[PDB]
Amino acid sequence: SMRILLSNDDGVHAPGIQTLAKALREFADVQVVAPDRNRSGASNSLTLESSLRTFTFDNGDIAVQMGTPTDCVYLGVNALMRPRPDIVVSGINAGPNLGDDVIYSGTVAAAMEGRHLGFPALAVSLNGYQHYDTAAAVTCALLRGLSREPLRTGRILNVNVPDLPLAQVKGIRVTRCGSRHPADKVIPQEDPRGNTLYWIGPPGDKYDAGPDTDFAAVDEGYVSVTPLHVDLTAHSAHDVVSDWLDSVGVGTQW
Amino acid sequence: SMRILLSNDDGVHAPGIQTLAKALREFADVQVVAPDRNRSGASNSLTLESSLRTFTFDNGDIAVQMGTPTDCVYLGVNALMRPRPDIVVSGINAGPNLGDDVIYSGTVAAAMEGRHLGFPALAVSLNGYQHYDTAAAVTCALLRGLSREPLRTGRILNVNVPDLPLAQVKGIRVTRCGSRHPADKVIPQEDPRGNTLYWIGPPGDKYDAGPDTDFAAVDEGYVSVTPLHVDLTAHSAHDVVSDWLDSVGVGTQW
Ligand SMILES: [Mg+2]
Ligand SMILES: [Mg+2]
Ligand SMILES: [Mg+2]
Ligand SMILES: [Mg+2]
């Protein structure tokens, strides 16, 4: 029987995490450790300058007060869940986590804190706000898959589910992260005293959203599965950077 | 003359950013947009549910109230600095940003918001707290390098500088991100009422810190330069994941 640490970024009160919890609890042992509020956009932020306080609800759900998604899964794996989880599942997020958006994603960051466990961590996002049932069914299928046979490579799976009835989901695609044009919108709003305050605007239009991208798969009505890692190295740039330094004489006398 | 957006994660009052600002201001036009406090560990977190307020100091430095490093550079590039910057520089951080730590780094996240500009963004971290002068000299050299000849590939450079007098710095190494064993320490501390609160503990020991890693370069007394990107795809896992799904019958009827 699977021991699952269930988290998210929308917080313990989100219908996405509550729907998923109910679904997982009929075949696995589930412990929720999640934020006390909506921490969308929290990325892999974590609390270093202060200790963290936990609040427990009547049903055993743990909220970490002011806790980030990373905080929650870190504490869950390393202190709060005993015996330790076999797997971390983060979701179901209200909204997609696609392309270069993933760098900002609390949903994904929560899953990343489960990267050292025996099973790949799952981040699960719904491309909308209606069909949580569909995302729950997809998640359960993946977990049953993992019970059938272990995944040998890939420590985090980023799963995006079309906001459609399950019957309309076309299948599954293994994808890579797409990307957007640079986001540049800032929305000013005056306070009552006439001071200009600034909202972060919507993202840029899709740029890389073709063959084999997560964007394209979801658009076409497929579940997108993208294996992720935490190595941020642009390996392909190595020789260019090295040659550039030599060319401009930085790091060398000659 | 270079127009530089200067940020960090330690905030506007940090000696690292103040030291660097002074150094850059004698050959470039510099605008500081940085957090109002120490936001170490903020990763690429950004403020979505609220507007952001800016506070300006006597010297023209802009602090974004409760602003994350990502918030600061985003607003700087897209609203607060006119004309727009040619480059983003984030640092000098008090402490290294190496290996898999970079996913949690506010220093690096700030630089990433400059990835769309004409010059590669620089994240600059000191491996200690003494020789900011050394890190400043290294940063200036890189910027002069960029004025000599453009870097054709690599949109973010993660720079780590040994905490040594410049004369003792051995040179420069183009590196890849190393990694650590899983971090698992949690430090409990009782509040005055007898409630257990939890601190995030120190990172795990170095795991991948050999040939060509950022860890190794800094340890040996070299400046480490690692080109980064925002594509989190584990490309090497693609076929394994695809074959696994087929094997366990997830996404396929057969
Ligand atoms: Mg969310
Ligand atoms: Mg030289
Ligand atoms: Mg810092
Ligand atoms: Mg099947």
Side-chain angles (χ1 to χ4, degrees), chain A residues 37-54 70-71 74-75 78-80 99-100 102-104 108 112-113 115-116 138 141-142 144-146 148-151 153-155 157 170-178 180-187 189 191-193 195-202 212 225-245 247-252, chain B residues 37-54 70-71 74-75 78-80 99-100 102-104 108 112-113 115-116 138 141-142 144-146 148-151 153-155 157 170-178 180-187 189 191-193 195-202 212 225-245 247-252:
Chain A
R37 76 190 88 273
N38 196 327
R39 297 302 293 268
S40 295
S43 189
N44 313 70
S45 61
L46 77 175
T47 306
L48 305 173
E49 71 179 343
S50 304
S51 61
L52 292 157
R53 192 178 289 276
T54 62
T70 296
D71 284 342
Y74 188 93
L75 290 181
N78 297 304
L80 303 177
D100 42 9
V102 298
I103 66 168
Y104 310 102
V108 170
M112 288 180 164
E113 286 313 304
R115 73 188 176 275
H116 320 287
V138 168
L142 285 166
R144 280 202 308 285
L146 289 165
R148 287 163 191 164
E149 174 190 322
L151 175 58
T153 307
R155 301 193 304 163
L157 301 182
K170 291 193 180 68
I172 198 157
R173 295 197 167 324
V174 183
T175 59
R176 61 182 185 78
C177 290
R180 299 181 182 278
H181 292 287
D184 61 13
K185 301 309 176 298
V186 172
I187 304 153
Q189 264 216 302
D191 75 10
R193 271 79 53 180
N195 307 117
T196 302
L197 310 180
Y198 309 95
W199 291 88
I200 296 179
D212 294 302
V225 176
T226 311
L228 307 179
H229 61 186
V230 296
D231 183 359
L232 302 189
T233 313
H235 296 285
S236 309
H238 188 272
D239 289 341
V240 179
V241 174
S242 309
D243 288 351
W244 172 76
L245 287 168
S247 188
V248 299
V250 172
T252 172
Chain B
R37 76 190 88 273
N38 196 327
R39 297 302 293 268
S40 295
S43 189
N44 313 70
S45 61
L46 77 175
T47 306
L48 305 173
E49 71 179 343
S50 304
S51 61
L52 292 157
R53 192 178 289 276
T54 62
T70 296
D71 284 342
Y74 188 93
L75 290 181
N78 297 304
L80 303 177
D100 42 9
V102 298
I103 66 168
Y104 310 102
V108 170
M112 288 180 164
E113 286 313 304
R115 73 188 176 275
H116 320 287
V138 168
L142 285 166
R144 280 202 308 285
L146 289 165
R148 287 163 191 164
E149 174 190 322
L151 175 58
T153 307
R155 301 193 304 163
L157 301 182
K170 291 193 180 68
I172 198 157
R173 295 197 167 324
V174 183
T175 59
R176 61 182 185 78
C177 290
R180 299 181 182 278
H181 292 287
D184 61 13
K185 301 309 176 298
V186 172
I187 304 153
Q189 264 216 302
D191 75 10
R193 271 79 53 180
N195 307 117
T196 302
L197 310 180
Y198 309 95
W199 291 88
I200 296 179
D212 294 302
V225 176
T226 311
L228 307 179
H229 61 186
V230 296
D231 183 359
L232 302 189
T233 313
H235 296 285
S236 309
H238 188 272
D239 289 341
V240 179
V241 174
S242 309
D243 288 351
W244 172 76
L245 287 168
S247 188
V248 299
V250 172
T252 172

Side-chain angles (χ1 to χ4, degrees), chain A residues 14-57 59-151 153-230:
Chain A
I17 196 175
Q18 299 295 0
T19 300
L20 187 57
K22 195 199 182 85
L24 301 183
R25 269 168 188 148
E26 44 186 39
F27 62 87
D29 295 319
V30 179
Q31 176 62 64
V32 171
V33 188
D36 60 343
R37 76 190 88 273
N38 196 327
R39 297 302 293 268
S40 295
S43 189
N44 313 70
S45 61
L46 77 175
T47 306
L48 305 173
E49 71 179 343
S50 304
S51 61
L52 292 157
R53 192 178 289 276
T54 62
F55 186 88
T56 309
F57 297 90
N59 74 339
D61 291 351
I62 300 169
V64 184
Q65 271 222 311
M66 301 299 317
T68 68
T70 296
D71 284 342
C72 293
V73 181
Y74 188 93
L75 290 181
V77 169
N78 297 304
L80 303 177
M81 194 176 177
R82 286 303 181 270
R84 290 162 180 87
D86 297 314
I87 198 172
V88 169
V89 179
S90 172
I92 303 154
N93 197 59
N97 277 292
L98 294 163
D100 42 9
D101 295 4
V102 298
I103 66 168
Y104 310 102
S105 177
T107 326
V108 170
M112 288 180 164
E113 286 313 304
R115 73 188 176 275
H116 320 287
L117 301 180
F119 290 96
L122 308 175
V124 183
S125 300
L126 183 67
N127 191 41
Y129 321 108
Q130 183 64 201
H131 294 282
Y132 291 114
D133 49 11
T134 299
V138 168
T139 303
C140 293
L142 285 166
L143 292 166
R144 280 202 308 285
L146 289 165
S147 80
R148 287 163 191 164
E149 174 190 322
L151 175 58
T153 307
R155 301 193 304 163
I156 304 133
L157 301 182
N158 191 42
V159 187
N160 280 267
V161 181
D163 193 18
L164 300 167
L166 191 60
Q168 289 178 226
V169 175
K170 291 193 180 68
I172 198 157
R173 295 197 167 324
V174 183
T175 59
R176 61 182 185 78
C177 290
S179 73
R180 299 181 182 278
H181 292 287
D184 61 13
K185 301 309 176 298
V186 172
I187 304 153
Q189 264 216 302
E190 274 182 56
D191 75 10
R193 271 79 53 180
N195 307 117
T196 302
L197 310 180
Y198 309 95
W199 291 88
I200 296 179
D205 296 344
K206 296 171 188 163
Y207 168 58
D208 180 11
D212 294 302
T213 69
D214 57 356
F215 281 131
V218 175
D219 286 348
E220 301 278 3
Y222 295 82
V223 174
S224 163
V225 176
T226 311
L228 307 179
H229 61 186
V230 296

Side-chain angles (χ1 to χ4, degrees), chain B residues 13-57 59-151 153-217:
Chain B
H13 307 291
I17 196 175
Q18 299 295 0
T19 300
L20 187 57
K22 195 199 182 85
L24 301 183
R25 269 168 188 148
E26 44 186 39
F27 62 87
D29 295 319
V30 179
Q31 176 62 64
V32 171
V33 188
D36 60 343
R37 76 190 88 273
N38 196 327
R39 297 302 293 268
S40 295
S43 189
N44 313 70
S45 61
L46 77 175
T47 306
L48 305 173
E49 71 179 343
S50 304
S51 61
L52 292 157
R53 192 178 289 276
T54 62
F55 186 88
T56 309
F57 297 90
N59 74 339
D61 291 351
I62 300 169
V64 184
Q65 271 222 311
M66 301 299 317
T68 68
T70 296
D71 284 342
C72 293
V73 181
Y74 188 93
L75 290 181
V77 169
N78 297 304
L80 303 177
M81 194 176 177
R82 286 303 181 270
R84 290 162 180 87
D86 297 314
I87 198 172
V88 169
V89 179
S90 172
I92 303 154
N93 197 59
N97 277 292
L98 294 163
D100 42 9
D101 295 4
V102 298
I103 66 168
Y104 310 102
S105 177
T107 326
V108 170
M112 288 180 164
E113 286 313 304
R115 73 188 176 275
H116 320 287
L117 301 180
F119 290 96
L122 308 175
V124 183
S125 300
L126 183 67
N127 191 41
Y129 321 108
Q130 183 64 201
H131 294 282
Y132 291 114
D133 49 11
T134 299
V138 168
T139 303
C140 293
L142 285 166
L143 292 166
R144 280 202 308 285
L146 289 165
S147 80
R148 287 163 191 164
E149 174 190 322
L151 175 58
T153 307
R155 301 193 304 163
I156 304 133
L157 301 182
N158 191 42
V159 187
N160 280 267
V161 181
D163 193 18
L164 300 167
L166 191 60
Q168 289 178 226
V169 175
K170 291 193 180 68
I172 198 157
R173 295 197 167 324
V174 183
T175 59
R176 61 182 185 78
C177 290
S179 73
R180 299 181 182 278
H181 292 287
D184 61 13
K185 301 309 176 298
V186 172
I187 304 153
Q189 264 216 302
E190 274 182 56
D191 75 10
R193 271 79 53 180
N195 307 117
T196 302
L197 310 180
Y198 309 95
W199 291 88
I200 296 179
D205 296 344
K206 296 171 188 163
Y207 168 58
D208 180 11
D212 294 302
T213 69
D214 57 356
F215 281 131

